[PDB]
Every structure is written in C-alpha cells, then in structure tokens.
Symmetry: D2
Subunit: 354 residues, 4 copies
C-alpha cells in the first residue's frame, strides 16, 4: 500500500526536491535513487543539497543506482527530470517496460498523446494516456509537467482565461539560476549583470503556455485561442530559487482588476477538491502589499511550501488591461512538486495502481 | 572663456560623474566641489569613487566647500543633484542669486515654467526659462533632467511617438542600486532577492514620461496623448550601474517592428546637429543579438561612454504591438551626462553666458 | 510546567530566531513579543522573516508590545538582543525588577560579576550570578553570550586550549550580512567588493575570545593565557547567514594535527551531558573534504540545526602550527540558539525557577 | 621601431588585458589575435570584454587566426595565457620555431632553465635563458610569470624577505571569478556562499611563492629559505577581478611593523629604475585607513592601473609577528600586465631584439 518511486537524476537540483518531499510523503516512498556519473556511491556523498534543511538521514546512505529499466522490477513510479535530448529515449524505454513515467523534461511535452499537465488546470487531459497506450502499444505511460517558467504565467493566466475574454499577455521574467542545473549558469554571467535567454527560450515559454491554455475547460467562449496574443522576454539573475514574472494582461471588453483578483483568490481545482497530499489549499495566493511578493520571502509560501504561485500587484492599467506579477518556486511547483501532485492525481484516477 | 561649474553633492554618486566628465570637458571646468557633512576636508579623502578609473589627481586635493550662494561669486554654472525635499529650496536660492541651475533632483520637475529636459527630445522647452524669469522675478534659472528610469523608456518612446500612432507602453524595469545613493538599498534587500519599488515609484515614472512625451514635436497627430496608456512595474536588483527596461509597445494601426527599428537607429536631435561635446553621435544604439544588451557589457556604449540608450530585441509581437528592451547608464545619461548635455545646449542657445 | 519568555527586539534578525526556535521548544514559550518602533501592530505584518520556513501561525497575529518591565509580571525569562548603548540600561532595569535576562548585546559583556557564556566552554561562570545579585542589589540577573564572530573562533580554540600548549591564533573572518541588522550593511559595500570592518572590530573580537579562554578549565597549564597571542582581521561579504573563519593556530611544542582533529570531533560539555533540548549532540562537527565547510551548505548542520560550529580543513602547517577553518551560524549558535541553551542551563542549575 | 606581438588565447579573460594594454603601448603592437574555437571570425563579435572600457576600434574587426607558428613569421613576440596541459607543448613549439614566448600558463613554471618571473623581484633569473637555448636546442625561449594568487603574496613577502629575518607567512586568500575563465566558476558556487579551492590549490600557491623567494637577492641571510614556513588557504567569492589576501607574517626576531611598512612603501626594482612603460611607479602602494584596500575601489590603483599590489592594515600582532592584507589585480599585474612588463625587461636586456 506504499508505492515505491525511483527518482532519475536523484542528485540534481530537481531530484533533490523529489527526495526532500517524498521522504515525507504518506504513501509514495523515495525508494530507488537513480544516477549515472556516480552509480555505486552513497547519495549523501555526491549530492548538492542546494535546498532547505538537510539530506534525510535514511536517504544519506543509499547507493546511487543505474538508470536501467530491467533492474527496477520492485519499482512502481518513475519520476524523470533528465536533460533534454537524453530524457525522451529513456522515458520511452521505461513506458515500454510497463512503468508509469512522470517527466519534468521537455522531450515529450508536445507529443499529442502525452499530457502536459498542470493538475489544477487541465486534469482531464490525463485521459490521453488511453490513446497513447493504444498508439504506442506499451503498458506503461508518460506524463510531462510544463516548464517551470511557463507554469509561473500559465497558472494565473489559466485561471483568468477560464472566466474572462483575455485576448493577450505580455510577460517579462526574471528567473533564478537553479533552473539551469549545475554547472548551469557561469557566475560571470550574473554577477553585476542580467542575462537574457534569447528568442528560442522566449518562443518555447509562449508555446507551452498556449498548449496549456488550449486545454483549459472555459466558462466563456471568446476570444478564440488563435486570436490570443502571447509574448515573453526572459532573463536570469543571481537568485537561487524562485522565478519572478511581470504580466500585462489584456482583454476584449472592459474588465476590472478587482474582479480578476477575486477569481484568482478563489481559484481551486480537482487537486483541492480531492484533497491530494501535495495539493496546496490555495494554489494561487494573492498578496496585497505594493512591494510583494519578493523572491526570497514568498517562494516557500502556502500550506504545502513552494506549491503555491504567489501573485501580487493587481492593478488596473486601462479598462482593458491590467498588470500583476506572479512568483513560482521553480523546482517545487515548477518541477518536482508539480510532478508529485501529478502522480497523486493519477493514483486517485486509477491510472497508477495502489 | 572656460566656464566654472560648482557641483553640489560633489561626493555623491551622481556628483562623481559630474566630476569625472567635467574634468575632461573642453570649456566647463569642475571648479567648486560643494558638500555639507564634510565641508573643510579634501575631496579625495571623503569621496566614494564607485565609478570607472580614479579620482582625477587635480581634483583629489580640493577642499569640499559650503553650499552657500553668497560665496560663489566666481561660479558660472550650478549642477544640483541634491536629495528630494532639500533640493527645491536650495535650487531656488541659487536662481534668485543669478545662477543658471541644472538640477537632477525631482523637486522642480513639474513646475510648469521649469523645463524637464531631454536635449534630444524637447529642446524647445528651454524657452520656458523666459516665462520663469518673469513669473519668479529672478535673474538666474532652473532646468531639471528627468528621472534616470523615466529617460530609459522616454527616449526610445519619444523617438517612437514622434513618428507612429503609439497608443500604449507597458514597461518593466530592473534597476541597479547606485540610483538610490549610499547607504541607499540595504544589502539584505537584494542579495538572492528582487526588491520591487511600489506604486509611488511606478506612478512617478509614468508621470515624468507623460510630460516628456507631451512636449515631443510630432510628425503624426494620432492618438492624442490623453488616450495613450502607460504603465510601469519597477524593481531594483544587485547591479551597480545600468537600468534594464523591457517595453511592450502598442499602436492604433498596424506597425512593423522593422520600421520602428530604422527610426530608432537613425534617431538624432539638435545635440547631434550642433555637435555639443557631450552629445553621443547615436543617442540611441540598436543591437541585433537576441542576448543583448546586457547591463554589464553595454552600459558604457557610445562615442561618449554611458550617454547612449542601448535598445535591443526589437521583435514583432502582433500587427499592433512590438517588444524591445532598452538599457540606460543611470548616472551618466540618466543624471550627470544628461545635465552636462543640457548645460552645453543652454550655452549654445545663449542662456548661459560664455 | 511552562516558562513564559519575553523576546526583546523580537522583529529583528536575532529576535526571529528566538521566535522560530522557541515556537518548537518543550518548555520555554515565546509569550511576549517586545518592540518599540512598531508597538501595537501584529508581529506578522511587521517582521522581516529572513530565516528558514514561515512565521509560526501562532506568532503572526500576536500584537507587538512595549519594552516595559512593569507590564510583564506573568513573564519568566527575558531575552535581550538590543543594539549597543540602548541594551545596557534596559537590561539593568529588567534585572532590577526581578527578571533573569539573557542578553546577546555587548553592553555588559565585560562587567566582572556578569557571565560571558558559551555553555559548552565556561559553564561554571554562571555562579558569578550570586555576587552579582548582592553587589547590584537585585533579585534578577544578567548573563550575556559573546559576539557571534568571537564564538566562531573561541569554541574550537576553547576545545584546543583545554588540552594543548596553544600559544597563539591568527584568524581571518568572512562574515555574513545578518549580523549587522537591517538596514545594516549598504548593498554597494559588498556587491563585487569585500568590506573590512577595521581595527575596533578586530580588537573587540580578540578581546571577547580572551575573556572566554580565561575561563576554560584546562587539563594543562602551559602556556599562561597572558602569554597567548590572538589576532583577527575581520570582513563581511554578501552571504546572508554564517561567518566563515580561517585559523592558524600556534603551539609551544610539537603538536599533531591528527590529535587536535580528534580532540575537536570528541568535544562535549555540560549541555551535551545534561541533554538540554537545544544542545546539539556534537557542538563541533568536523568535516574531512578539502572543499568544506561551505557557508551555504553547512551552516544549518547538527541535530539542532545552526547550533554546531562546523570545522574543516585541519592540517599540519609545520610541527608547531596547524590550520583550520570554522563556520558558525551567527544568529542561531552566535546569538538566539546560544541564549536559549544558556537559559536551559540556568534552569537545570536552578538559577531560573518555576 | 615597432615590435609585433601575437596574443594566444586572445578572446579569453587574460587575453583581453593584452589587447587592452597593448593597444596603448608605445612599441609592442597587438598585431596577431590568435585562437582555436573561433578561428575566422572577427574578434569583436566573439570576445567577452569583461574589462574596463570598450574593445579598441582597431582590434574589433581583426580576424581571429590559427595558433600556428609557421604563419607568424612577421611576429616578434608571442604571449601565451593558454590553459594547463595544452600550453606546455604549444609554448615549446613556438620557442623551437625561434620565438620569445612569455607565458602566463603553469606548464613550464618549474622547469629549472625557465624563469618564473616577477620583474620587480627576481629580474636576474632572465639569464636562465642562455643555458635554456643550449640545452633545449632552440633559438626562441620561454619565460613564465607566476600564478596571480602567488604574486599577490610574493610581491610583499619578497620585499619583506629581502630585508627582514622572515620565518613564515600564513595566508588567507579571497579570490575573484575571472581567474577561472569562462564558463569557469558555476554561479551556484558563489551566490550566498564562499568556495574553498582545496589542498591542491593551496599547495601550488605556496610552491610558486617558494620558488620566487628562493630567487630574491637578500641583504640579510637569516633564516635559511628551507626553514621558512608558508601556508595558504584559498577561496573564491563573487567579485569580478582582484584577489584579496590576509597575511600573518612571522620573524625570527623582534621586528617593528612601522619599519616593514616603510620598507613596503619604499619598494622599487629594475622596472622602476629602467622606467619600462608598464612599470608602475610604486609597485607596492601602502594604504593607511583601517578599512582599505577594498577590492572594488583599489584594484585599478597605480599610475599604470592594475599593476600595483596595494597593501593595507599593517600592524603589530606581537613582537615577532605582524599582519597585513594585499590586493592584486589578477589579470593585469597577476597575468597580462606582468607578461608585458617581462617583455619590456627582456627588450631592455637585449633578450628580444628588433
Ligand atoms: C534538472 C536539471 C536542472 C539538471 O540539473 P543538474 O542539477 O545539472 O542534474 P545533472 O545533469 O547534474 O545530474 C543529476 C544526475 O542525473 C544523471 N544524468 C545525467 N544524464 C543522464 C542520463 N542520460 N541518464 C541517466 N542519468 C543522467 C547525472 O549523472 C547525475 O547523476 P549521478 O548522481 O550519477 O552523478 C536539468 O536536468 C534540466 O534542465 N532538466 C529538464 C527539467 C527542467 O526543466 N529543469 C529545470 C527546472 S526549474
Ligand atoms: C544622488 C543621490 C543618488 C544621493 O547620492 P548619495 O551618493 O547618497 O549623496 P549624498 O546624500 O551622500 O551626499 C553627497 C554630498 O551632498 C551633501 N548633501 C546632502 N544634503 C545636502 C543639502 N541639503 N545641502 C547640501 N548638500 C547636501 C552631503 O552631505 C554629501 O556631502 P559631503 O561630501 O559634504 O560629505 C540622491 O541625492 C538622490 O536620490 N538625488 C536626486 C537625483 C536622482 O534622481 N538621483 C538618482 C540618479 S540615478
Ligand atoms: C539584531 C541586530 C543585528 C539589529 O537587527 P535589526 O533587525 O536591525 O534590529 P532592530 O533595529 O530592527 O531591532 C528591532 C526591534 O527592536 C526594537 N528596538 C530598537 N531599539 C530598541 C530599544 N532601545 N528598546 C526597545 N526596543 C528597541 C525596534 O524598534 C524594532 O522593534 P519593532 O518590531 O517595534 O519595530 C542589532 O539589534 C544588534 O546588533 N544587536 C546586538 C545583538 C547581536 O546579537 N548582534 C550580532 C548578531 S550575529
Ligand atoms: C585565461 C583563462 C583564465 C581561461 O579563460 P577563458 O576566458 O576561459 O579562456 P578560453 O578557454 O576561453 O581561451 C580562449 C581562447 O583561447 C583558445 N584556446 C583554448 N585552448 C587552446 C589551444 N590548445 N590552442 C590554441 N588556443 C586555445 C580558445 O578556443 C579561445 O579561442 P577563440 O577566440 O578561437 O574562441 C585560462 O585559459 C587559464 O586558466 N589560463 C592559464 C593562465 C592564467 O593566467 N590563469 C589565471 C589568470 S588570473
Ligand atoms: Mg549537471
Ligand atoms: Mg547618502
Ligand atoms: Mg534595525
Ligand atoms: Mg573558456
């Protein structure tokens, strides 16, 4: 009745958050710590514990093991936050061996039969696993979570687009360094500097947000998603966790910032109704002070820390446009937290057997 | 035939750029270094030389002197980058004593008879000094330069609004710490954090930009400036100089990013035509690489370093909206450089006598 | 039964560690949040929670109250991290009123009848409290704990001095910003810079280390303390918590690094033997990798996190000299954690009573 | 007449200081920008100009060329800041071809017949070049300059060792990021952290200091060098240039701090006496304020900026021990500036010839 998870890239920056969260989870245990350049070594000795608290005592001494589908008979869930390009073949192997695969990597995010999942936003799309199982002829499956940076905007925008005639969002991000991994960003890129990431990163942000938005079940029907204008300009500075995003949001019809603020405050989905262990009770928190949120003080907010997107500064810009900022914890909600939540969602919908 | 300048707040962060630039200027000399908490002491011993190179040898040994209009008979130009609230009375005293006053402080920026001057943009408004002299009954005058952060956006927006039906701009800034002075920003506000400045700072940014824009002499006549929507969201991170601003710019009619890019590339005004010593030959530089400009590498650009606004990332967002970023050097163009340029402009229009 | 503690300076950097640690303590409650600037406001809306986790839900809504002894009669214990100069007389009045006062301020640290206490090193000096009550004519008392930066060195030099013929130490500190409070250190002192603190600060570090050393019960008696030579050169850089110190330690005779290392790993005193709730098991943890300790990763070490000094890099320099580094958490061990531990000890010794 | 220099590694951190300094040099021209990764592209579009000022207008359009001796026949002098392991054989081939090679790489720094040169301290070792040509059977030669971090200590300990009975030094370094190149140091090693470099790196610092010390002509002869005790504990933090070192210096007899201080302010050698263009007037500047030097403010010191070691904080620790700090610019003095100065000296001594 405890489910046994294998964490690929266990010692990485996303891996350690699977480690930290699961070693407190009521029924999903970090059982198998997969790696590659350090297999054979205790985890406690290779890991870069760039996160809160301490490596759990009962994890510190487990050996890092091979990422090999045929050695994991004992394993029920695979979480896969592996590098682009390597991740897609490994995830496929795993699904072909019968495993359910919850992946934080981009490789599979746009396969039409793979969900791109934000459990509060497009929970119905896990039914794509049925067409996936048939089309690919395998027993297991793959699910992906979006790009941390895309979830920072897609969540408050999902909630908004659900209930208002939102026809554009123009965003700037200032992201922290732990998203790029280790060695990831050279210190000389961000000491006394700001490092923009370029056109391919901006275009990949907007493209993930559009597929999320196109799967939101809406209460109004205008504008079409074809006519919605998105754009992002992204950057990295020297913060360790936490992506801060400034959004100007546009509408087809006059729309009051105070209305939007109430839909954000009260936003909830099936993770809240179902009470999944990792579901924050306010997946969006709204702050009211004109100097918040601040990366350092607000990235660990919520009853489940780091799982809430904290949104602030709602203000009317003109009748048809408002401004807000949102701060997500890029490796908890943006990555490991989100994938946990997804795994709980699939256990409760019977896709992963208990 | 050399003009003798007094630099108020000479040892401050803006003062030292008046010092650094003027001690190379062909005919305006840093002659009188005014201070207050350190009067009587050599400049070389109190100054925080938080800028490029070294205190000039021939300045290092001059005494810091009183900020007292009646002791400056020998002085021809006053540059005044004093703190809000103290600056306005001192500047007035100075004008009443017969001095021309070029001020970087906010106190006077919205007196209807005081120019708010960006020499490339609204050069004709120095004629407000005539109505000022009459109304206030004094011999000298006051000129102000805008808020460094407002010039970072007002310049590329001035150039744009001059020639296109620009109906909005939605901006985010990420400003460096030297604008707030010393002690200015507590280290704990920006180490591993981003510090937003709040509603009063955003509203003061947009209000300075609107008065600039309303004084641009335009080649088209739509929309009215009443119907133009501005908004800013401002922040400070741990960079030392350089304010980086992301602008989404909106239009009433279909407008191509490649058109706008040519008007920006070729933008010039009377400072360029007149050849003032401190006028960059491209007051706007356009970079083409999707990871530029970067604060650290581009804040000292241009044939007159730090005087050019470097604008990058021009890209079409939809037919009616484009995105660009601009980087200004907040204490050269945003402050001392700008005020120099203003002083050269007034010497050449005969307002300051040679 | 429960002791009720008042925390003076409760919203400050050191105050918050009192609130965070006391909120989990089996018997010392944070009952009375004292202040002055923000008296009458909820703690949670004023505090800067620049620490691990979130303000405790039970503390957040508590009103900040006057720092006034005649209003605290239901209070047992007063903890005082007030700024120099202000602390001294406030501590006195509290003592005089009948309270035990545990202070982290420098004011009384050299009164002959006042302990300067690290519970692991000079625990019998608590008996100064009896001459203290009689010559001060009060029923309360004052106890202080040492400057954080003096503790980061004295705890390892205490353990060394107890057992070896130690004749000097020559220390370099690289201290974090939280020790200076907020607004404390200007961000322009330490971005792309290192800030030395100067002679006063080096002299005061050394002077506290000597007082503590003079109170260590030793198992040898060579050399005399008056013949020991201590020096410190101190600095701050842009870390949030944690003070890293390099120590070159000298001896009167051939002394083996491997033996010191072991005397450090085996260090233990009264708090450990009594099992006080805030006593770490290993008040000195010794690390072996030639790249540790690192501030970010080792400052929250120990089974009571922040309470252990972590020491690394033990090495033979020549036969009479060894080198080590140590890392202390400056506001847990260095201030609030050590005051809590002091209060535990006084309870167990019956100096503080239900 | 003009010497034509090839700069190997010309786009790197140390390379750029060659280009910047050589572009103003009266007689050594940066004629041949060598590389490998970016051969055939303009320098200005590849380089990272992480230094003062802007790429020189004459250098920007120059093609990056092969690092190939048979293509440089018009070249006089080769300067080689190549990475360990790769430098050694490339330097050899250049020598063998007939070039003088001045190297900043560690490869040849311990060859018995190769100088390890700081022109102010062991200038006669240049005469190793004659046995070098004969036993290597080449017409060119190799000369190296020491690790920047070894220079920051050896220049002041050289001046001290020449005149006083110095029996050890015990050093703490706090080094900047540019010494590791780019991508060099991961930003997560040094944001909110300090990175020790470990034993290898401490051993190699000390070992270079000893070789240089062994070559200082002394005016005393106590103690023997083999009896001198050196130690280093080194680290990197998030500054861009400048390596700050604290030195506790030991002596065999009562030695007065005030006298050392003066021997440091009066230090001078051959480069000063010959007036070489890159020789600062005061290769050691001594500062008096108990808060200086500071990396940000004192690393570009001297009438040739970056070429002086700045020393502060001189102080008596006990009668046989003093403390000081020093600040070296690691890629000007510590690498390119010192190679230029070495080349000057060799020209004046006739080792390099028109
Ligand atoms: C998570 C991420 C940030 C990399 O972080 P990192 O901290 O640099 O992780 P790493 O590449 O160092 O390695 C983690 C472990 O995975 C292993 N790994 C790398 N490639 C592997 C592969 N092909 N197969 C198996 N394991 C692999 C590493 O060897 C290391 O293992 P070890 O402990 O055996 O030594 C990066 O993988 C990534 O960009 N992932 C896609 C998910 C994402 O969007 N992340 C950013 C979220 S904010
Ligand atoms: C320029 C500015 C950033 C302050 O910088 P700072 O580096 O903190 O300057 P300071 O307040 O320290 O002092 C500069 C000197 O001016 C003096 N000064 C302060 N108040 C004064 C007054 N009322 N009259 C005369 N001088 C005064 C100071 O005593 C000091 O003098 P000293 O050298 O005698 O000791 C701040 O004045 C400001 O915000 N100014 C308005 C202009 C602006 O927008 N600046 C930001 C531009 S990016
Ligand atoms: C902790 C310390 C670093 C300052 O930090 P801080 O976060 O800047 O502290 P503050 O100035 O903010 O003190 C905060 C509270 O104490 C209150 N306080 C200040 N002076 C006071 C006084 N004379 N009486 C009562 N309260 C006082 C402040 O008003 C504030 O209260 P509030 O919540 O009503 O607004 C500083 O007090 C100090 O240096 N203390 C000596 C103790 C120490 O431990 N130093 C080094 C720690 S590693
Ligand atoms: C300067 C140094 C710090 C590295 O910095 P960098 O900016 O990272 O240097 P690179 O790896 O970028 O070297 C840059 C150029 O040299 C070229 N280079 C590298 N290996 C080479 C080789 N074997 N042969 C020829 N060129 C080589 C690179 O391709 C690049 O050339 P490009 O412009 O064609 O692309 C590093 O080379 C080093 O540690 N050198 C030893 C010298 C030193 O002075 N160290 C400490 C200085 S304080
Ligand atoms: Mg990696
Ligand atoms: Mg000031
Ligand atoms: Mg305070
Ligand atoms: Mg490189």
């Amino acid at each position: 009745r405890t489910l046994k998870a294998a964490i690929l890239g266990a010692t990485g920056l996303v891996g350690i958050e699977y480690v930290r969260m699961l070693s407190n989870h009521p029924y999903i245990k970090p059982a198998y710590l997969a790696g590659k350049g350090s297999v054979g070594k205790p985890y406690g000795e290779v890991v870069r514990w760039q996160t809160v608290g301490q490596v759990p005592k009962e994890i510190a001494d487990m050996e890092i093991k091979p990422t090999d589908p045929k050695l994991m008979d004992d394993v029920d869930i695979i979480f896969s936050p592996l590098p682009q390009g390597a991740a897609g073949p490994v995830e496929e192997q795993f699904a072909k061996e019968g495993f359910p695969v919850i992946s934080n990597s981009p490789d599979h995010r746009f396969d039409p039969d793979v969900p791109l999942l934000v459990p509060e936003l497009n929970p119905h799309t896990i039914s794509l696993i049925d067409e996936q199982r048939k089309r690919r002829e395998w027993k297991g499956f793959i699910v992906t979570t979006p790009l941390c940076t895309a979830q920072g905007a897609a969540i408050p925008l999902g909630a908004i687009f659900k209930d208002y005639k939102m026809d554009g969002a123009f965003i700037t991000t200032i992201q922290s360094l732990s998203g790029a991994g280790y060695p990831g960003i050279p210190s000389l890129d961000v000491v006394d500097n700001i490092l923009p990431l370029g056109d391919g990163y901006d275009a990949k942000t907007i493209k993930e947000i559009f597929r999320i938005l196109s799967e939101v079940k809406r209460n109004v029907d205008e504008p079409k998603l074809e006519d919605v204008s998105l754009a992002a300009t992204t950057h990295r500075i020297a913060t360790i966790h936490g992506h801060y995003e400034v959004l100007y949001v546009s509408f087809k019809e006059e729309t009051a910032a105070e209305k939007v603020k109430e839909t954000l405050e009260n936003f909830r989905g099936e993770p809240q109704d179902l009470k999944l262990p990792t579901a924050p009770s306010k997946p969006i928190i709204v702050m009211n002070e004109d100097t918040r949120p601040q990366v350092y003080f607000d990235r660990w907010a919520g009853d489940i820390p780091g799982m809430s997107v904290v949104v602030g500064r709602l203000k009317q810009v003109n009748k048809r446009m408002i401004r807000l900022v949102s701060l997500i914890h890029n490796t908890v909600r943006g990555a490991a937290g989100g994938g946990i939540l997804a795994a709980e969602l699939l256990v409760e919908k019977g896709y992963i057997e208990k």
